[PDB]
Design a protein around this nucleic acid. Structure first.
Ligand SMILES: [Mg+2]
Ligand SMILES: [Mg+2]
Ligand SMILES: [Mg+2]
Ligand SMILES: [Mg+2]
Length: 211
DNA sequence: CCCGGACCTGTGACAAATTGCCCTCAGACGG
DNA sequence: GCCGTCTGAGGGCAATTTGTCACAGGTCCGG
């Protein structure tokens, strides 16, 4: 009953910094690209508003600001870096935007991760979108999984801001909040435990199930 | 023994950013 | 052919959430 996003693990594990609104758009580009290709995609205001339950007005504000914040953003596959866009976005018709994704990214978009788009569209924090994508990469058909993520690798790939290198801030402003959104906003039920070595906490062990 | 120091934890404050809302007004279209 | 309506491109808001750092309070190490 809703679009099935699929993506290469290389994207699930890439290093980048995107907002919620930018990540939302990114799912549709990947959907458009995959159903086929030169890299030219399109986004309609009225569709976006309906997909994510926004008004037309607030949808228009989100697309425009997301689009101008792509400039200078870069993507790293672990390493090799690429720009997302190679030409500015533009509007041929009122309510329509046309975009030029870097055609060299295609092979990185299409050993894979998959999720239905309704699973993530109510999540607000972009780091919690990242965590839920990384967990889906390990999900079994039946709907459960278990994975150990290294703390430095979380910090390197999700590009956490610098103060989350102090572990008490990492717990309070990233881990607990994102485990709670997932438990409150997705059909997943998530638990975790800390792996320690000496005084330092080194990994987080995630277990999850489906409702 | 106890010190100062280097680690670690959690919490109170405040700053910066983001959220869904609200209001204006001209574009595109059809009847 | 004009206008009424549906859109969406602008401009804003206060309430919450996210990002930063000082200080309280624990351990062990080496002198
Ligand atoms: Mg918004
Ligand atoms: Mg004393
Ligand atoms: Mg006390
Ligand atoms: Mg002390």
């Amino acid at each position: 009953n809703s679009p099935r996003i699929v993506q290469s693990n290389d994207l699930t594990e890439a290093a980048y910094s995107l907002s919620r609104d930018q990540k939302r758009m990114l799912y549709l580009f990947v959907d458009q690209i995959r159903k086929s290709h030169d890299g030219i995609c399109e986004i309609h205001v009225a569709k976006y508003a309906e997909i994510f339950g926004l008004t037309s007005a607030e949808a228009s504000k989100d697309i425009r600001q997301a689009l101008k914040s792509f400039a200078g953003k870069e993507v790293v596959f672990y390493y090799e870096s690429f720009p997302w866009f190679i030409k500015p976005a533009h509007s041929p018709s009122r309510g329509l935007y046309s975009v030029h994704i870097n055609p060299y990214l295609i092979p990185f978009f299409i050993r894979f991760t998959q999720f239905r788009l309704s699973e993530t569209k109510e999540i607000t924090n972009p780091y919690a979108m990242r965590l839920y994508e990384s967990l889906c990469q390990y999900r079994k058909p039946d709907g459960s999984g278990i994975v150990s993520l290294k703390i430095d690798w979380i910090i390197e790939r999700y590009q956490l801001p610098q103060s989350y290198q102090r572990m008490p801030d990492f717990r309070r402003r990233f881990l607990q909040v994102c485990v709670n959104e997932i438990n409150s906003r997705t059909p997943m039920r998530l638990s975790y435990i800390e792996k320690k070595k000496g005084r330092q906490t080194t990994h987080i062990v995630f277990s999850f199930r489906d409702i």
